[PDB]
Every structure is written in C-alpha cells, then in structure tokens.
Amino acid sequence: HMPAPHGGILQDLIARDALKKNELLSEAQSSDILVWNLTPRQLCDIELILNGGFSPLTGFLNENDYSSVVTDSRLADGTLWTIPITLDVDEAFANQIKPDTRIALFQDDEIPIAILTVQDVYKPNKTIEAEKVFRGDPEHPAISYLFNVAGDYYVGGSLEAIQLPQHYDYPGLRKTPAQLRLEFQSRQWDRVVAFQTRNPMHRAHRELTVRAAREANAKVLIHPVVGLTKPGDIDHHTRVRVYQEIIKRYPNGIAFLSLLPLAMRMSGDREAVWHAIIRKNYGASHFIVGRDHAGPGKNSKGVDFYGPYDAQELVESYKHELDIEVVPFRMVTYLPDEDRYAPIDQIDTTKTRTLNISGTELRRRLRVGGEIPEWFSYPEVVKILRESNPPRPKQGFSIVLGNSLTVSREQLSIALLSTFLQFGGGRYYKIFEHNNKTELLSLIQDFIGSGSGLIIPNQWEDDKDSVVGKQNVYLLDTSSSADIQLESADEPISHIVQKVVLFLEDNGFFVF
Amino acid sequence: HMPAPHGGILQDLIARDALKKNELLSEAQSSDILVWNLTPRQLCDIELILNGGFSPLTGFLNENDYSSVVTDSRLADGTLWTIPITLDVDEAFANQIKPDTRIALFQDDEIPIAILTVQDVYKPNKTIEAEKVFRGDPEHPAISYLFNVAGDYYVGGSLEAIQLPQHYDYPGLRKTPAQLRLEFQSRQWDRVVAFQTRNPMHRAHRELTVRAAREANAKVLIHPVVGLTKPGDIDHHTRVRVYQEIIKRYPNGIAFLSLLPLAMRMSGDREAVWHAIIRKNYGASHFIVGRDHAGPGKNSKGVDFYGPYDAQELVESYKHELDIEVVPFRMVTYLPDEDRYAPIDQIDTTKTRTLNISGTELRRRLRVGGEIPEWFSYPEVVKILRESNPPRPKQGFSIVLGNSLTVSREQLSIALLSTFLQFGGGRYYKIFEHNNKTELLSLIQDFIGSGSGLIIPNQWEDDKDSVVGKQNVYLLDTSSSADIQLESADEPISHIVQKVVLFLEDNGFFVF
Ligand code: NA
C-alpha cells in the first residue's frame, strides 16, 4: 500500500551523489567557483529537492517546466506539480551566469549545500505568476513575497548534493523521505495517513486524526511544517513542544511524529495538491486535507483568498492520478452532554448543546489569562502555549514620548520609571535611549519579547519605523495618532504619569 | 569514536541472507526438513545472533568454542566471550540429527525463524559449566535453569536468517544494531554511553546517567532488557512505560531509548563483559557497569552470588581489549539540604543529613500505599508503578478452607462471601470450586491478579501445588502450617468468619 514516489523514483540526491561528496565539496570550496548564498525560503526548498521530498524534481525549475506549472499545474512532461520551485536571483548575479555554468549554493555564507549546473536564466512575468498561481490578490502572502523578497530572475538548473541544510534542533526528528519510509517498514506500517499543520494541535485535531486512522485502517503520521509557515505565527519550537506532548494522547503505537522542513506559500488550493505530493514522497498512502487547507485567510476587504473547500476538491479531483487517498476534515463542534466532537452536519443545534472556541477567543484567553476548557485542548498543551504567549501581566511594552511633548523628557522618564517600580510583580523596567541608532532600535522588540517595560524619551526617524515593530509599542503624544493622547503638551508630569499608568492598567499590563 | 562491531564486522545475518529469503522460507516450511520449536530463551538469543548484537557469532556455539568460552571466557579463536550461547535440545531430537543436517527453527510452532546447518552435537558437562561459568552455587538462576530447563544436548551450527522473532509490542522501539547505528549517524552522535537495566529508573538513575554523559562528552542510550530478566520481576511493559516517561526528564536531544531483546543469565561478572560486547555491537563507545551488575543477589544463607564490584573490575580489566570505555556507577545518597545525589565517598555522614530509600522500603510503600518522596522518583513514574503494583486494599487473594475443618464448607463459604460483600471497596468476590482440575487451578492467580477475592471450599492435591502460586493465598486450617490457624476443627462459623476478616484487615486487604 505504501505509495511509490511522485514520478516513480525517490530523487534522494544525497544518496545518489554520496561517492562524489568530497569531490563536490572541494569544487564548492574552491575560489574559482561563483557563490550564491541561499535565502531562507530557498534553504527549505533545496532541502526537499536533495531530500527527494520534491520528487521528481532534481533542481530548480527551468523556464519550460515553470511555465507549464504556472499555466497547467504540471511539469513539461505532464507530471502534476502546482507550486513553482524556482531559484530567484538578482540582476547582478544573473549577469555572471550562462548555460552550463557551475554554481555553488551555500548556507549562512559558509556551509556547502550543493552544486548547481545552470541551463536557464529568465526574467519571469510576476504578474502572470501571481495571477495564475496565487489567484492575483495583492495581499496574498505568496504574491507579496513574490514581488518584495523574491529576486526578479529565475535560474533553472540541475543539482548535485553535498549535504542537507544544517539544523541543530530536533535531530533525528527531521526524518528524510528515505528514513521515514524505512521507519514505516521497521514498524510494518502499510497504510499511513498524514496530517498537515502549521499550528498547535488541540483535542479536536487528536480526535479527527484518530478517527481518520480508524476509518482508513492506517497509522498516523503527524507531519508538522517547521521550515516556514505563515508570517507572524507561533514559533515552530513551541509547536513542536505541543506536538511532542499531544503525540502521547494517542493509543500506543498508532502515531509517529516527524518534522517537514517545508516552506509554505499559503497557496491553499495548489498548495494542498503540493502537500499531497510531498507526503506521498514521504511514504503516505493517505493525506488529510482540511477546510481552507493552507489558506492565508481574509484580505483587507474581508474577502477570502480561497473557498473553504477549494483545497479538498482540487486534491480529490487529482487523487486517482496522484495515487493517494484523500481524507477530508469536516467542520466539527463539541457536544457537552456527551463529551465528544461531531460533524456540524449531523447536529441540530435546536435540540443539542454545542461548544466551540474560535482562534480569536483562544488568542483572547491567552492575552487576558483566562481559563481554557479541558475539552477544547489538553492541559499540558495549554501550559505550553501559556509560556510562549504570556498574558498581558507578563508582557513587555514600550512607551514612547511624543515629539509634541514640551515637558522635561528626562524628568518624565524618571517619574514613569519610579512609578512603574512601585507596582512590581517581576517586570524589569528601563529608560531606553536609542539616539536613532539602528543597533539599539533593533533591540526594542527584544526587550518587549523579554517582558520588559521600556520608557523611551524620544521618537525615532520615520525611515526606521520598519526597524522596530509596532507590537506593544505605545505613543504618548497630543497628535490624534497617539495611543495615549494628552490634551496639552505642557501638562504636569503627575498628570501625564497617571494617564499612562491607567492606560497600561486598562490594557492589562498592570494588575492590582 | 563509534566502536566497530566485536570481531570487526557486524554479523547482521538478516541483511546478508536477504537475497535468499523466499528460498530459505520455502525450505523451512517444507515437509522433509526437520523442525524445532525455539524455547523462549532460545528466541531472545537467536534474535541477537541474527541481529548482529552477538557479533561475531553466526550461530550457536559448538563444542570447540563452547569449552573455550567456559574455561577461558574466550572463543576458540581467542576472541573475548564470557556467556555460552547454545541451543539446548532434548535427547530424542538429538538422535534425529547428525552433522550437516539442516534444521528449521520455528517460533510458536508456526513462524519460520532460521535454518540451522548442524556442525556439532554434544552432551556438555553441566556440572562444569555451572561451576566455571556461573560459580557453582546451585541457587544461582542460571545454574537452576541449566539443570531444570535447559536441554542436555547442545547443537552447534551455523544459521541462515529468515526473519527475526515476531513482536507486536513496541514496534520500531526494538532497534537492531544496524538500525541504532543508523539512528546515531542521523543525529551526528559519535560518543554514546549505554545504560543497562532490568528495573525501573528513578531520579537517581536519571542523575547518574546525565552525569555520565557530561563527563564522557557523550549522548545517552537507555538500553533496557525486555526479554528475560530476573525470575519474578516487573514485566517489561510496566518498565517500558517508566522508561518512556523518564526519558522525558532529560535535556532535549541528549538521550534515546531502545529495547534490547536480551535473555539475561544473571551471571553478574561474566554477563557484564557480555553486555559491554553487545552494547559495543549496538554502537556504544561507553558502557555503564554498576554495583552488583547483573547480580542475582543473595542465596539462602544470605551469601552474595557476586561481589559488589566484581562486575566493574572484570569489564574494566578487558576494556582496552574490548575497545570501549567503562563508566562505573558509584553508590549514591540523597542530600536533602542540597537537593542532590552525591557519592557516599565525599559525604560526612556525621555533619551531613542524607536520605535513601531501599528497594525493600519502596516495595513496602507500594504494598501499603504510602507516600514516595518526589526526590526519590518522578511522580509520573510512581503513578505507573502504583497502577502495576496495587496496594493491599486493591490486591486480590484467596482463602482456602483447610482439610481439618469439620464445619459445613457450603455454609462457611457463603458466610465469608456475604460478610466480605459488606465491606465493598471495588473488589469482586467469588466462591471458587476447582475440583482439583488444572484448567481451573491455573486461573486462581489470574483472579488474584485481577484484585479479586476467592473463597476456595477445598484444598487441591499436593501433586498440583505447582500449578497454583503462593502469592496472597492463605490457608484456614488447624495445622501449624496454616496462615489463619484455628483452635479446633468445628468452631462456630461466625467465629471462623471473624478470624478470617480480622486477618485480612490486619494484612491490608480491608480498610475502614
Ligand atoms: Na526568504
């Protein structure tokens, strides 16, 4: 039952180029070879290629495959493939390469990853890519990256592997497709259903998953993404701690945890098919496709990027060709009087109690510090989330003295500092003078991340608002754009202080 | 630094007889081939041989290697080897085999394990083996087995791998030498200190092990024995739960758990060297040898089978030759005022407060349901042991109405039953009539194991005492050998019932 890789053969480049390692290593570490440092998304991508995770890929797509993928969701030879995997480069580097040029791809400017043999260098129409691949919405994460982070030139080419990107965390937890397939054989695991996730798992996830295992007669592979998920989500370290904990809530010998160095595009539809392909290469006969699978969410005008079922239908439409089975996850609700989750479909809310916790409410219960029902998520998991996302009483913040203020900045700072220290509780306070220095402005969010309260005497230049981070940063000024608005610019310091103290207290930072 | 298998090459027979599996499988289940059902111990041994764990062995020892092992703890060709791995068969079967004869070794009379090409057939002097290998003391677990269970004819010969013995529990947890070494390579693990154990691990074990890793700059491998340990012990299931729980009390990425299908001989001295060899084949550069390692304990006269440090000394004396480092575990004690364990060596018992819990005191607290300090063993661990080893109020038992009783057996049993039911407490009570049947006597202990209280109307024949089991079985008689001794043979029933009730209450079974 274990699926053959996509395209019939596991492109384990690490294993195929084993004997030539030192040979490739040297060439890569020679001063005669042109060097290109891989960006974060590229590092995740290249790992899956050398890995065989992106079978049948063997390098970054050339214009021929890239175009076929963009317009037909297939490689030039017809193989289903929905996400363009290209090596984006800038004009400068582009002008130093031509077909057959040998490039060395490094990590952190010092670790030899692989040797790339160019065969194509083109300047893709990002308008068409954004439209045909990511549905053209300018706010879509992939399209934003496409235009502001991705180089404007793609470099098609074949790769020869030196070593997979270096990782120092979760060793042996990042099993390659070959290792996973071998692990499944050790356990005599025939049928395996894989679960995609870039989020923490709660009881519902544990139940829906065990259910899939039961109905599909397969074992469970919890395959969390730890490379790059949606921008601004929970760090993977925290998620992995949650996974390692929830894995213990499954009957013994039913589930296995393994991390996927994937860099998502949040391209729902196509991404789902891409996900099915990837797990297939990793050895899964079944793939769970959730509601709005890999969906960013809603845009500015509240419009959804993808339809709630777009992903499940797309994968379902290609499953026979992919030779995998799709396990659709229907929306579910909790029935208190039975202590069980059930498909919304079969519930008459008119004659049955139902409980549900939205992501917003959860984010709120972690901000406020309120209890989280044990039926929604396991105790151990909630504790883990509580540590990473502390309630406002344990959160850091920053109070910036507006430019409109005329009071003694030094005195107001001393006054605020002295005042905050009366409340105590654990938070460390500091009058922070940056002097419009980037080396110091870059530390603001670090102190806030540490729960520290910073009193900042002056504002920084607008051409640096990007160096800081708006999170928990409040402006004290007379302007209508301030978070703490003073009626005048020459108010008594005690007047000003009280306004700030009560503001913070109202926002939950101080508790008495 | 990762040692090379003992003998130079890992004898992973399963891997060398792969391209011959179907072929060998056929011969095994063929009608002509002579078949032999592998005994439980023979299964653990054969699995280690086909495994490679017993490198350089490639089959059971013949008379040449055997005698060499017995007298000089080495194999004919010199190679270090202290424990005699041989195929013990009965007389009858020995007479159907001659040199070059091929035998099919089965598991549970239906699973083809391996084909054996006989080379030797001899009747070893068990009086010499018991002496030179296990020190002679008749009460020694290995010598007892040697005479009362082991066959009298050893069959030497080579083996051809069909498949390792079947296990449905802890799949993928029982990694082979080849697998472990791979698992180590995947984690960039070079130096590995292996920890051996056939018992639960407590905080002391976690601390000593972590300390070992720190001193030898190595990762930790918890390598528990799940085959056959010491007669009458904690089943490997309970211990595995304990291991999987304590394995989580280690710094992330420091330790790894793997099960060893070893059938210990409890041969302290020699077995420690044997363990070092085995662990060496598994990829461990460091091995922990503790106080009275693999020691049976004390005999009747209260005399130790082995000296506290015989095992550490022996392995230490062969380490250079074995090419592995020995990590000695020194006796330790708990320091309350410092919350840490320290060697008895540097502790001024006079000026220092120290706490220790004996194996006997632990056994007592589990029987009584008393508290077990957090410093001694992790809560999760205690929970597990408590559930596997229930305290008296949750224990089962049997009251056997003696032969000397002249009172009505039908009425006494009924009175005991109705009286017991008054107390409640979750225990299930039953009047059990065996009629001296084996099919029924064999269930007595199963019932007691289920926490039940059995009321047995009559004693069973002496020729069947071996079919029952002494644990929590009490005799109500007049004889001085009775557990609940009665003054006369025809005491009023109410009088008898009370003596029995108060006896069970004084012994913990009843709590009010
Ligand atoms: Na990037």
Side-chain angles (χ1 to χ4, degrees), chain A residues 38-43 88 145 149-150 228:
Chain A
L38 297 166
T39 66
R41 187 217 229 175
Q42 299 180 339
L43 262 163
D88 53 303
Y145 184 92
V149 198
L228 282 192

Side-chain angles (χ1 to χ4, degrees), chain A residues 359-378:
Chain A
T360 310
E361 187 53 43
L362 176 61
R363 185 173 309 90
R364 174 190 164 292
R365 299 202 185 188
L366 290 174
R367 189 183 67 253
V368 159
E371 293 298 307
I372 295 165
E374 208 165 308
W375 55 258
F376 172 73
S377 180
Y378 302 86

